[PDB]
Amino acid sequence: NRFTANIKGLTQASRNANDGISIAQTTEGALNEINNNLQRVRELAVQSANS
Amino acid sequence: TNSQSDLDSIQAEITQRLNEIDRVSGQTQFNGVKVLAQDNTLTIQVGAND
């Protein structure tokens, strides 16, 4: 009985962990978009600096 | 030798040339920036560094 419980818990635990990776990837997409927007802002600031 | 009626015409030319070098420096601009009207420093951001 103990082994069955562990096996169930491990698989389910494994099944939830994939979800954590998915959440990280989702955050990364948004973060990547933010970074892209930021790169443009820095370039614009450099252009803006000239007298 | 030059008469004073000569010097009047030469002065008319000289004042017109000086009005012209006052005009072409007073109102000349690259992107709305009077280059010769006033003295100042234009700083160029030539690098990613500050």
Side-chain angles (χ1 to χ4, degrees):
Chain A
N1 186 312
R2 315 236 190 290
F3 289 123
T4 287
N6 271 2
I7 273 134
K8 292 226 158 101
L10 283 194
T11 273
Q12 176 49 264
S14 162
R15 295 176 64 186
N16 85 40
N18 277 316
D19 169 38
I21 282 182
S22 278
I23 216 183
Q25 267 159 25
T26 271
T27 299
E28 272 210 302
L31 271 191
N32 273 339
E33 141 184 13
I34 278 186
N35 192 66
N36 268 137
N37 289 284
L38 266 170
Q39 297 305 41
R40 179 60 178 163
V41 155
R42 157 173 259 265
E43 183 178 2
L44 279 186
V46 153
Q47 161 166 61
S48 64
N50 289 337
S51 64
Chain B
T1 299
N2 283 322
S3 53
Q4 292 163 351
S5 295
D6 201 310
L7 293 182
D8 287 12
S9 88
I10 278 180
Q11 194 55 53
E13 186 67 287
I14 281 182
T15 63
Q16 195 78 270
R17 294 288 197 175
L18 293 178
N19 286 166
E20 200 243 12
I21 80 172
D22 198 14
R23 168 204 77 85
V24 78
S25 92
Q27 43 210 28
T28 186
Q29 42 182 61
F30 178 82
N31 206 3
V33 181
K34 311 288 189 185
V35 281
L36 290 188
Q38 216 75 32
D39 183 350
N40 65 329
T41 58
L42 299 86
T43 59
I44 302 285
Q45 192 57 208
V46 166
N49 267 350
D50 282 5

Coordinates of all heavy atoms in Angstrom, one line a residue:
Chain A
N1 N 0.8 -1.2 0.0 CA 0.0 0.0 0.0 C 0.8 1.3 0.0 O 0.5 2.2 -0.7 CB -1.0 0.0 1.2 CG -1.9 1.2 1.1 OD1 -1.5 2.3 0.9 ND2 -3.2 0.9 1.3
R2 N 1.9 1.3 0.8 CA 2.8 2.5 0.8 C 3.4 2.8 -0.5 O 3.4 3.9 -0.9 CB 3.9 2.3 1.8 CG 3.4 1.7 3.2 CD 3.8 2.6 4.3 NE 3.6 1.9 5.6 CZ 2.4 1.7 6.1 NH1 1.3 2.0 5.4 NH2 2.2 1.1 7.3
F3 N 3.8 1.8 -1.2 CA 4.4 2.0 -2.6 C 3.4 2.5 -3.6 O 3.7 3.3 -4.4 CB 5.1 0.7 -3.0 CG 6.3 0.4 -2.3 CD1 6.5 -0.8 -1.6 CD2 7.3 1.3 -2.2 CE1 7.7 -1.1 -0.9 CE2 8.5 1.1 -1.5 CZ 8.7 -0.1 -0.9
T4 N 2.2 2.0 -3.5 CA 1.1 2.5 -4.4 C 0.9 4.0 -4.2 O 0.9 4.8 -5.1 CB -0.2 1.8 -4.3 OG1 -0.1 0.4 -4.8 CG2 -1.3 2.5 -5.0
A5 N 0.8 4.4 -2.9 CA 0.6 5.8 -2.6 C 1.8 6.6 -3.1 O 1.6 7.6 -3.8 CB 0.5 6.0 -1.1
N6 N 3.0 6.1 -2.9 CA 4.2 6.9 -3.4 C 4.1 7.0 -4.9 O 4.4 8.1 -5.4 CB 5.5 6.2 -2.9 CG 5.9 6.8 -1.6 OD1 5.2 7.6 -1.0 ND2 7.1 6.3 -1.1
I7 N 3.8 5.9 -5.6 CA 3.8 5.9 -7.0 C 2.7 6.9 -7.6 O 3.0 7.6 -8.5 CB 3.5 4.6 -7.6 CG1 4.8 3.8 -7.8 CG2 2.8 4.7 -9.0 CD1 4.7 2.4 -7.2
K8 N 1.6 6.9 -6.9 CA 0.5 7.8 -7.3 C 1.0 9.3 -7.1 O 0.7 10.1 -8.0 CB -0.8 7.6 -6.6 CG -1.4 6.2 -6.9 CD -2.9 6.4 -7.2 CE -3.4 5.3 -8.0 NZ -4.1 4.2 -7.2
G9 N 1.5 9.6 -6.0 CA 2.0 10.9 -5.6 C 3.1 11.3 -6.5 O 3.2 12.5 -6.9
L10 N 4.1 10.4 -6.8 CA 5.2 10.8 -7.7 C 4.7 11.2 -9.1 O 5.1 12.2 -9.6 CB 6.2 9.7 -7.7 CG 7.1 9.7 -6.5 CD1 8.3 8.8 -6.7 CD2 7.5 11.1 -6.1
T11 N 3.8 10.4 -9.7 CA 3.4 10.6 -11.0 C 2.6 12.0 -11.1 O 2.8 12.8 -12.0 CB 2.4 9.5 -11.5 OG1 3.2 8.5 -12.1 CG2 1.5 10.1 -12.5
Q12 N 1.7 12.1 -10.1 CA 0.9 13.3 -10.0 C 1.8 14.5 -9.8 O 1.6 15.6 -10.3 CB -0.1 13.2 -8.9 CG -0.9 14.5 -8.7 CD -1.5 15.0 -10.0 OE1 -0.9 15.9 -10.6 NE2 -2.7 14.5 -10.4
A13 N 2.8 14.3 -8.9 CA 3.8 15.3 -8.6 C 4.5 15.7 -9.9 O 4.7 16.9 -10.2 CB 4.7 14.9 -7.6
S14 N 4.8 14.7 -10.7 CA 5.5 14.9 -12.0 C 4.7 15.6 -13.0 O 5.2 16.4 -13.8 CB 5.9 13.5 -12.5 OG 6.2 13.6 -13.9
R15 N 3.4 15.4 -13.0 CA 2.3 16.0 -13.8 C 2.0 17.5 -13.5 O 1.5 18.2 -14.4 CB 1.0 15.2 -13.7 CG 1.1 13.8 -14.2 CD -0.2 13.0 -14.0 NE -1.3 13.6 -14.7 CZ -2.6 13.2 -14.6 NH1 -2.9 12.2 -13.7 NH2 -3.5 13.8 -15.2
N16 N 2.2 17.8 -12.3 CA 2.1 19.2 -11.8 C 3.4 20.0 -12.1 O 3.3 21.2 -12.4 CB 1.6 19.4 -10.4 CG 2.7 19.2 -9.3 OD1 3.8 19.7 -9.5 ND2 2.4 18.6 -8.2
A17 N 4.5 19.4 -12.0 CA 5.8 20.0 -12.3 C 5.9 20.4 -13.8 O 6.5 21.5 -14.0 CB 7.0 19.0 -12.0
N18 N 5.3 19.7 -14.7 CA 5.4 20.1 -16.1 C 4.7 21.5 -16.3 O 5.2 22.3 -17.0 CB 4.7 19.1 -17.0 CG 5.7 17.9 -17.4 OD1 6.8 18.2 -17.7 ND2 5.2 16.7 -17.3
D19 N 3.7 21.6 -15.5 CA 2.8 22.8 -15.4 C 3.7 24.0 -14.9 O 3.5 25.1 -15.4 CB 1.7 22.6 -14.5 CG 0.9 23.9 -14.2 OD1 0.8 24.8 -15.1 OD2 0.5 24.1 -13.0
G20 N 4.6 23.8 -14.0 CA 5.5 24.8 -13.5 C 6.4 25.3 -14.7 O 6.6 26.5 -14.8
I21 N 6.9 24.4 -15.5 CA 7.7 24.7 -16.6 C 6.8 25.5 -17.6 O 7.3 26.5 -18.2 CB 8.2 23.5 -17.3 CG1 9.4 22.8 -16.6 CG2 8.6 23.8 -18.8 CD1 9.9 21.6 -17.3
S22 N 5.6 25.1 -17.8 CA 4.7 25.9 -18.7 C 4.5 27.3 -18.2 O 4.6 28.2 -19.0 CB 3.4 25.2 -18.8 OG 3.4 24.1 -19.7
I23 N 4.3 27.5 -16.9 CA 4.2 28.8 -16.4 C 5.4 29.6 -16.6 O 5.4 30.8 -17.0 CB 3.6 28.8 -15.0 CG1 2.6 30.0 -14.8 CG2 4.6 28.9 -13.9 CD1 2.1 30.2 -13.4
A24 N 6.6 29.0 -16.4 CA 7.8 29.7 -16.6 C 7.9 30.2 -18.1 O 8.3 31.3 -18.3 CB 9.0 28.8 -16.2
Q25 N 7.6 29.3 -19.0 CA 7.7 29.6 -20.4 C 6.7 30.8 -20.7 O 7.1 31.7 -21.5 CB 7.4 28.4 -21.3 CG 8.6 27.6 -21.7 CD 8.3 26.2 -22.1 OE1 7.1 25.9 -22.5 NE2 9.2 25.3 -22.0
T26 N 5.5 30.7 -20.2 CA 4.6 31.8 -20.4 C 5.1 33.1 -19.9 O 5.0 34.1 -20.6 CB 3.2 31.5 -19.7 OG1 2.4 30.8 -20.6 CG2 2.5 32.8 -19.4
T27 N 5.7 33.1 -18.7 CA 6.3 34.3 -18.2 C 7.4 34.9 -19.1 O 7.5 36.0 -19.3 CB 6.8 34.2 -16.8 OG1 5.7 33.8 -15.9 CG2 7.4 35.5 -16.3
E28 N 8.2 33.9 -19.6 CA 9.3 34.2 -20.4 C 8.9 34.9 -21.8 O 9.6 35.7 -22.3 CB 10.2 33.0 -20.7 CG 11.3 32.8 -19.7 CD 12.5 32.1 -20.2 OE1 12.3 31.0 -20.8 OE2 13.6 32.7 -20.2
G29 N 7.8 34.4 -22.3 CA 7.3 35.1 -23.5 C 7.0 36.5 -23.3 O 7.5 37.4 -24.1
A30 N 6.3 36.8 -22.2 CA 6.0 38.2 -21.9 C 7.2 39.0 -21.6 O 7.4 40.1 -22.0 CB 5.1 38.2 -20.7
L31 N 8.1 38.4 -20.9 CA 9.4 39.0 -20.5 C 10.2 39.3 -21.8 O 10.8 40.4 -21.9 CB 10.2 38.2 -19.5 CG 9.9 38.5 -18.1 CD1 10.8 37.8 -17.1 CD2 9.8 40.0 -17.9
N32 N 10.2 38.4 -22.7 CA 10.9 38.6 -23.9 C 10.3 39.8 -24.7 O 11.1 40.6 -25.2 CB 10.9 37.3 -24.8 CG 12.1 36.4 -24.5 OD1 13.1 36.8 -23.9 ND2 11.9 35.1 -24.8
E33 N 9.0 39.8 -24.7 CA 8.4 41.0 -25.4 C 8.7 42.3 -24.8 O 9.0 43.3 -25.4 CB 6.8 40.8 -25.4 CG 6.1 42.1 -25.2 CD 4.6 41.8 -25.1 OE1 4.2 40.7 -25.0 OE2 3.8 42.8 -25.2
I34 N 8.8 42.3 -23.4 CA 9.1 43.5 -22.7 C 10.5 43.9 -23.0 O 10.8 45.1 -23.2 CB 9.1 43.2 -21.2 CG1 7.6 43.4 -20.7 CG2 10.0 44.2 -20.4 CD1 7.5 43.3 -19.1
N35 N 11.4 42.9 -23.1 CA 12.8 43.2 -23.4 C 13.0 43.8 -24.8 O 13.7 44.7 -25.0 CB 13.7 41.9 -23.3 CG 15.1 42.2 -23.3 OD1 15.7 42.8 -22.4 ND2 15.8 41.8 -24.4
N36 N 12.2 43.3 -25.7 CA 12.2 43.8 -27.1 C 11.8 45.2 -27.1 O 12.4 46.1 -27.7 CB 11.3 43.0 -28.0 CG 12.0 41.8 -28.7 OD1 11.5 40.7 -28.8 ND2 13.2 42.1 -29.2
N37 N 10.7 45.5 -26.3 CA 10.2 46.9 -26.3 C 11.3 47.8 -25.7 O 11.5 48.9 -26.1 CB 8.9 47.0 -25.5 CG 7.8 46.4 -26.2 OD1 7.2 47.0 -27.1 ND2 7.3 45.2 -25.8
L38 N 12.0 47.3 -24.6 CA 13.0 48.1 -24.0 C 14.2 48.4 -24.8 O 14.8 49.4 -24.8 CB 13.5 47.3 -22.7 CG 12.8 47.8 -21.4 CD1 13.1 46.9 -20.3 CD2 13.2 49.2 -21.1
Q39 N 14.6 47.4 -25.7 CA 15.7 47.6 -26.6 C 15.5 48.8 -27.5 O 16.4 49.6 -27.7 CB 16.0 46.4 -27.5 CG 16.3 45.2 -26.7 CD 17.5 45.4 -25.8 OE1 17.6 46.4 -25.1 NE2 18.4 44.4 -25.7
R40 N 14.2 48.9 -28.0 CA 13.9 50.1 -28.8 C 13.9 51.4 -28.1 O 14.4 52.4 -28.6 CB 12.5 49.9 -29.4 CG 12.1 51.0 -30.3 CD 13.0 51.2 -31.5 NE 12.6 52.3 -32.4 CZ 13.4 52.9 -33.3 NH1 14.7 52.5 -33.4 NH2 12.9 53.8 -34.0
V41 N 13.5 51.3 -26.8 CA 13.5 52.6 -26.0 C 14.9 53.1 -25.8 O 15.1 54.3 -25.8 CB 12.8 52.3 -24.7 CG1 13.4 53.3 -23.7 CG2 11.3 52.5 -24.8
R42 N 15.8 52.2 -25.6 CA 17.2 52.6 -25.4 C 17.8 53.2 -26.6 O 18.4 54.2 -26.6 CB 18.1 51.4 -24.9 CG 19.5 51.6 -25.2 CD 20.3 50.4 -24.6 NE 21.0 50.8 -23.4 CZ 22.2 51.2 -23.3 NH1 23.0 51.3 -24.4 NH2 22.7 51.6 -22.1
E43 N 17.5 52.6 -27.8 CA 18.0 53.1 -29.0 C 17.4 54.5 -29.3 O 18.1 55.4 -29.7 CB 17.7 52.2 -30.2 CG 18.2 52.7 -31.5 CD 17.9 51.8 -32.7 OE1 17.3 50.8 -32.4 OE2 18.4 52.1 -33.8
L44 N 16.1 54.7 -29.0 CA 15.4 56.0 -29.1 C 16.1 57.0 -28.2 O 16.2 58.2 -28.6 CB 14.0 55.9 -28.8 CG 13.1 55.3 -30.0 CD1 11.6 55.4 -29.6 CD2 13.4 56.1 -31.2
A45 N 16.4 56.6 -27.0 CA 17.1 57.6 -26.1 C 18.4 58.0 -26.6 O 18.8 59.2 -26.6 CB 17.3 56.9 -24.7
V46 N 19.2 57.1 -27.2 CA 20.4 57.4 -27.8 C 20.2 58.4 -29.0 O 21.0 59.4 -29.1 CB 21.2 56.2 -28.4 CG1 22.1 56.6 -29.5 CG2 22.0 55.5 -27.3
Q47 N 19.2 58.1 -29.8 CA 19.0 59.0 -30.9 C 18.5 60.4 -30.4 O 18.9 61.4 -31.0 CB 17.9 58.5 -31.8 CG 17.2 59.5 -32.7 CD 16.4 58.9 -33.8 OE1 15.4 58.2 -33.5 NE2 16.7 59.2 -35.0
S48 N 17.7 60.4 -29.3 CA 17.2 61.7 -28.7 C 18.3 62.6 -28.1 O 18.1 63.8 -28.0 CB 16.2 61.3 -27.7 OG 16.7 60.6 -26.6
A49 N 19.4 62.0 -27.7 CA 20.5 62.8 -27.0 C 21.1 63.9 -27.8 O 21.5 64.9 -27.2 CB 21.5 61.8 -26.5
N50 N 21.3 63.7 -29.1 CA 22.0 64.7 -30.0 C 21.4 66.1 -29.8 O 20.2 66.2 -29.5 CB 22.0 64.3 -31.4 CG 22.9 63.1 -31.7 OD1 23.8 62.8 -31.0 ND2 22.6 62.4 -32.8
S51 N 22.3 67.1 -29.9 CA 21.9 68.5 -29.8 C 20.9 68.8 -30.9 O 20.0 69.6 -30.7 CB 23.2 69.4 -29.9 OG 23.7 69.3 -31.2
Chain B
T1 N 42.9 108.8 -55.6 CA 42.1 109.1 -56.8 C 40.6 108.8 -56.8 O 39.8 109.6 -57.4 CB 42.7 108.3 -58.0 OG1 44.0 108.8 -58.2 CG2 41.8 108.6 -59.2
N2 N 40.1 107.8 -56.1 CA 38.7 107.5 -56.1 C 38.0 108.7 -55.4 O 38.4 109.2 -54.4 CB 38.4 106.2 -55.3 CG 38.7 105.0 -56.1 OD1 38.5 104.9 -57.3 ND2 39.3 104.0 -55.4
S3 N 36.9 109.1 -56.1 CA 36.1 110.2 -55.6 C 35.2 109.8 -54.5 O 35.1 108.6 -54.2 CB 35.3 110.8 -56.8 OG 34.5 109.7 -57.4
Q4 N 34.5 110.7 -53.9 CA 33.6 110.3 -52.8 C 32.3 109.8 -53.4 O 31.6 109.0 -52.7 CB 33.4 111.5 -51.9 CG 34.6 111.9 -51.1 CD 34.6 113.2 -50.5 OE1 33.7 114.0 -50.8 NE2 35.6 113.6 -49.7
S5 N 31.9 110.1 -54.6 CA 30.8 109.5 -55.3 C 31.2 108.0 -55.6 O 30.3 107.2 -55.8 CB 30.4 110.2 -56.5 OG 29.9 111.5 -56.1
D6 N 32.4 107.7 -55.7 CA 32.9 106.3 -55.8 C 32.7 105.6 -54.5 O 32.3 104.4 -54.4 CB 34.3 106.3 -56.3 CG 34.7 104.9 -56.9 OD1 34.4 103.9 -56.3 OD2 35.3 105.0 -58.0
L7 N 33.1 106.3 -53.4 CA 33.1 105.6 -52.1 C 31.7 105.4 -51.6 O 31.5 104.5 -50.8 CB 33.9 106.5 -51.1 CG 35.4 106.6 -51.4 CD1 36.2 107.4 -50.4 CD2 36.0 105.2 -51.5
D8 N 30.8 106.2 -52.0 CA 29.4 105.9 -51.7 C 28.9 104.6 -52.3 O 28.2 103.8 -51.6 CB 28.5 107.1 -52.2 CG 28.6 108.3 -51.4 OD1 29.6 108.4 -50.5 OD2 27.8 109.2 -51.5
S9 N 29.3 104.3 -53.6 CA 28.9 103.1 -54.2 C 29.6 101.9 -53.6 O 29.0 100.8 -53.4 CB 29.1 103.1 -55.7 OG 30.5 102.7 -55.9
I10 N 30.9 102.0 -53.3 CA 31.6 101.0 -52.6 C 31.1 100.7 -51.2 O 31.0 99.5 -50.8 CB 33.1 101.3 -52.7 CG1 33.7 100.9 -54.0 CG2 33.9 100.6 -51.6 CD1 35.2 101.2 -54.2
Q11 N 30.7 101.7 -50.5 CA 30.1 101.5 -49.2 C 28.7 100.8 -49.3 O 28.3 100.0 -48.5 CB 30.0 102.8 -48.5 CG 29.6 102.6 -47.0 CD 30.6 101.7 -46.3 OE1 31.8 101.9 -46.4 NE2 30.1 100.7 -45.6
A12 N 28.0 101.2 -50.4 CA 26.7 100.5 -50.6 C 26.9 99.0 -50.9 O 26.1 98.2 -50.3 CB 26.0 101.2 -51.8
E13 N 27.9 98.7 -51.7 CA 28.2 97.2 -51.9 C 28.7 96.6 -50.6 O 28.3 95.4 -50.3 CB 29.3 97.1 -52.9 CG 29.6 95.6 -53.3 CD 28.5 94.8 -53.9 OE1 27.5 94.5 -53.3 OE2 28.7 94.5 -55.1
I14 N 29.5 97.3 -49.8 CA 30.0 96.6 -48.6 C 28.9 96.4 -47.5 O 28.8 95.3 -46.9 CB 31.2 97.5 -48.0 CG1 32.4 97.2 -48.8 CG2 31.4 97.2 -46.5 CD1 33.6 97.9 -48.3
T15 N 28.0 97.4 -47.4 CA 26.8 97.2 -46.5 C 25.9 96.1 -47.0 O 25.3 95.4 -46.2 CB 26.1 98.5 -46.2 OG1 25.5 98.9 -47.5 CG2 26.9 99.5 -45.6
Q16 N 25.8 95.9 -48.3 CA 24.9 94.9 -48.8 C 25.5 93.5 -48.6 O 24.8 92.5 -48.2 CB 24.6 95.1 -50.3 CG 23.4 94.2 -50.7 CD 22.1 94.8 -50.2 OE1 21.6 94.5 -49.2 NE2 21.5 95.6 -51.1
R17 N 26.8 93.4 -48.7 CA 27.5 92.1 -48.4 C 27.5 91.8 -47.0 O 27.3 90.6 -46.6 CB 29.0 92.2 -48.9 CG 29.2 92.3 -50.4 CD 28.8 91.0 -51.0 NE 29.4 90.9 -52.4 CZ 29.3 89.8 -53.1 NH1 28.7 88.7 -52.6 NH2 29.9 89.8 -54.3
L18 N 27.6 92.8 -46.1 CA 27.5 92.5 -44.7 C 26.1 92.2 -44.2 O 26.0 91.4 -43.3 CB 28.1 93.7 -43.9 CG 29.6 93.9 -44.1 CD1 30.1 95.1 -43.4 CD2 30.4 92.6 -43.8
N19 N 25.1 92.9 -44.8 CA 23.7 92.4 -44.5 C 23.5 91.0 -45.0 O 22.7 90.3 -44.3 CB 22.7 93.4 -45.2 CG 22.6 94.7 -44.6 OD1 22.1 95.6 -45.2 ND2 23.1 94.9 -43.4
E20 N 24.2 90.6 -46.0 CA 24.0 89.2 -46.5 C 24.7 88.2 -45.6 O 24.1 87.1 -45.4 CB 24.5 89.2 -48.0 CG 24.0 88.0 -48.7 CD 25.1 87.2 -49.1 OE1 26.2 87.3 -48.6 OE2 24.9 86.3 -50.0
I21 N 25.9 88.5 -45.1 CA 26.5 87.6 -44.2 C 25.8 87.7 -42.8 O 26.1 86.8 -42.0 CB 28.0 87.7 -44.0 CG1 28.3 88.9 -43.0 CG2 28.7 87.9 -45.3 CD1 29.8 89.0 -42.7
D22 N 25.0 88.7 -42.5 CA 24.2 88.7 -41.3 C 23.0 87.8 -41.5 O 22.5 87.1 -40.6 CB 23.9 90.1 -40.9 CG 23.4 90.2 -39.5 OD1 23.5 89.3 -38.7 OD2 22.8 91.3 -39.2
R23 N 22.4 87.9 -42.7 CA 21.2 87.1 -43.0 C 21.5 85.6 -43.1 O 20.8 84.8 -42.5 CB 20.5 87.6 -44.3 CG 19.4 86.7 -44.8 CD 19.2 86.9 -46.3 NE 20.3 86.2 -47.1 CZ 20.2 84.9 -47.5 NH1 19.2 84.2 -47.1 NH2 21.2 84.4 -48.2
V24 N 22.5 85.2 -43.9 CA 22.7 83.8 -44.2 C 23.2 83.0 -42.9 O 23.2 81.8 -42.9 CB 23.7 83.6 -45.4 CG1 25.1 83.8 -45.0 CG2 23.4 82.3 -46.1
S25 N 23.7 83.8 -41.9 CA 24.0 83.1 -40.7 C 22.9 83.3 -39.6 O 22.8 82.5 -38.7 CB 25.3 83.7 -40.1 OG 25.0 84.8 -39.3
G26 N 22.1 84.3 -39.8 CA 21.0 84.5 -38.9 C 19.9 83.5 -39.0 O 19.4 83.0 -38.0
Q27 N 19.6 83.2 -40.3 CA 18.5 82.3 -40.6 C 19.0 81.2 -41.5 O 18.8 81.2 -42.7 CB 17.3 83.0 -41.1 CG 17.6 84.1 -42.2 CD 16.6 85.2 -42.2 OE1 16.0 85.5 -41.1 NE2 16.4 85.8 -43.3
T28 N 19.7 80.2 -40.9 CA 20.0 79.0 -41.6 C 19.9 77.9 -40.5 O 20.1 78.1 -39.3 CB 21.4 79.0 -42.2 OG1 21.6 77.8 -43.0 CG2 22.5 79.1 -41.2
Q29 N 19.4 76.7 -41.0 CA 19.0 75.7 -40.0 C 19.0 74.3 -40.6 O 18.6 74.1 -41.7 CB 17.6 76.0 -39.4 CG 16.6 76.4 -40.4 CD 15.3 76.8 -39.8 OE1 15.1 77.7 -39.0 NE2 14.2 76.0 -40.2
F30 N 19.5 73.4 -39.8 CA 19.3 72.0 -40.0 C 18.4 71.5 -38.9 O 18.8 71.5 -37.7 CB 20.7 71.3 -39.9 CG 20.6 69.8 -40.1 CD1 20.5 69.2 -41.3 CD2 20.6 68.9 -39.0 CE1 20.4 67.9 -41.5 CE2 20.5 67.6 -39.1 CZ 20.4 67.0 -40.4
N31 N 17.2 71.1 -39.3 CA 16.1 70.6 -38.4 C 15.8 71.6 -37.3 O 15.8 71.2 -36.1 CB 16.5 69.2 -37.8 CG 15.4 68.4 -37.4 OD1 14.2 68.7 -37.7 ND2 15.6 67.2 -36.8
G32 N 15.5 72.8 -37.7 CA 15.1 73.8 -36.8 C 16.1 74.3 -35.8 O 15.8 74.9 -34.8
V33 N 17.4 74.1 -36.1 CA 18.5 74.5 -35.2 C 19.3 75.5 -35.9 O 20.0 75.2 -36.9 CB 19.4 73.2 -34.9 CG1 20.5 73.7 -33.9 CG2 18.5 72.1 -34.3
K34 N 19.2 76.8 -35.4 CA 20.1 77.9 -36.0 C 21.5 77.6 -35.6 O 21.9 77.8 -34.5 CB 19.6 79.2 -35.4 CG 18.1 79.4 -35.5 CD 17.7 79.7 -36.9 CE 16.2 80.1 -36.9 NZ 15.7 80.3 -38.3
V35 N 22.3 77.1 -36.6 CA 23.7 76.8 -36.4 C 24.6 78.0 -36.1 O 25.5 77.9 -35.2 CB 24.3 76.1 -37.6 CG1 23.9 74.6 -37.6 CG2 23.8 76.8 -38.9
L36 N 24.5 79.1 -36.8 CA 25.4 80.3 -36.6 C 24.8 81.5 -35.8 O 25.6 82.4 -35.5 CB 25.9 80.8 -37.9 CG 26.9 79.9 -38.6 CD1 27.5 80.6 -39.8 CD2 28.0 79.5 -37.7
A37 N 23.5 81.5 -35.5 CA 22.9 82.6 -34.8 C 23.5 82.8 -33.4 O 23.7 83.9 -32.9 CB 21.4 82.5 -34.8
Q38 N 23.6 81.6 -32.7 CA 24.1 81.7 -31.3 C 25.2 80.7 -31.0 O 25.3 79.7 -31.8 CB 22.9 81.4 -30.3 CG 23.0 82.2 -29.0 CD 22.6 83.6 -29.2 OE1 21.8 84.0 -30.1 NE2 23.2 84.5 -28.4
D39 N 26.0 80.9 -30.0 CA 27.1 80.0 -29.6 C 26.7 79.0 -28.6 O 26.2 79.4 -27.5 CB 28.3 80.8 -29.2 CG 29.5 80.0 -28.9 OD1 29.3 78.7 -28.8 OD2 30.6 80.5 -28.7
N40 N 26.9 77.7 -28.8 CA 26.5 76.7 -27.9 C 27.2 75.4 -28.3 O 27.8 75.3 -29.4 CB 25.0 76.5 -27.8 CG 24.4 76.0 -29.1 OD1 24.9 76.3 -30.2 ND2 23.4 75.2 -29.0
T41 N 27.1 74.4 -27.5 CA 27.7 73.1 -27.8 C 26.6 72.1 -28.2 O 25.5 72.1 -27.6 CB 28.5 72.6 -26.6 OG1 27.6 72.5 -25.5 CG2 29.6 73.5 -26.2
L42 N 26.9 71.4 -29.2 CA 26.0 70.3 -29.7 C 26.8 69.1 -29.3 O 28.0 69.0 -29.6 CB 25.9 70.4 -31.2 CG 25.4 71.7 -31.8 CD1 26.5 72.7 -32.0 CD2 24.7 71.4 -33.1
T43 N 26.2 68.2 -28.6 CA 26.8 67.0 -28.1 C 26.3 65.8 -28.9 O 25.1 65.6 -29.0 CB 26.6 66.8 -26.6 OG1 25.2 66.7 -26.3 CG2 27.2 68.0 -25.8
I44 N 27.3 65.0 -29.4 CA 26.9 63.9 -30.1 C 27.1 62.6 -29.3 O 28.1 62.4 -28.7 CB 27.7 63.8 -31.5 CG1 27.5 65.0 -32.3 CG2 27.2 62.5 -32.2 CD1 26.1 65.1 -33.0
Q45 N 26.0 61.8 -29.3 CA 26.0 60.6 -28.6 C 26.5 59.6 -29.6 O 25.8 59.2 -30.5 CB 24.6 60.2 -28.2 CG 24.5 59.0 -27.2 CD 25.3 59.3 -25.9 OE1 25.8 58.4 -25.3 NE2 25.4 60.6 -25.6
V46 N 27.8 59.4 -29.6 CA 28.6 58.5 -30.5 C 29.1 57.3 -29.7 O 30.3 57.2 -29.5 CB 29.7 59.3 -31.2 CG1 30.6 58.3 -32.0 CG2 29.2 60.3 -32.2
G47 N 28.2 56.4 -29.4 CA 28.5 55.2 -28.6 C 27.3 54.8 -27.8 O 26.4 55.7 -27.7
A48 N 27.3 53.6 -27.2 CA 26.1 53.2 -26.5 C 26.3 53.8 -25.1 O 25.4 54.0 -24.3 CB 26.0 51.7 -26.4
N49 N 27.6 54.1 -24.7 CA 27.9 54.6 -23.4 C 27.4 56.0 -23.2 O 27.3 56.8 -24.1 CB 29.4 54.5 -23.2 CG 29.8 53.2 -22.5 OD1 29.0 52.5 -22.0 ND2 31.1 53.0 -22.4
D50 N 27.2 56.3 -21.9 CA 26.6 57.6 -21.6 C 27.5 58.8 -21.9 O 27.0 59.9 -22.4 CB 26.3 57.7 -20.1 CG 25.0 57.0 -19.8 OD1 24.4 56.4 -20.7 OD2 24.5 57.0 -18.6

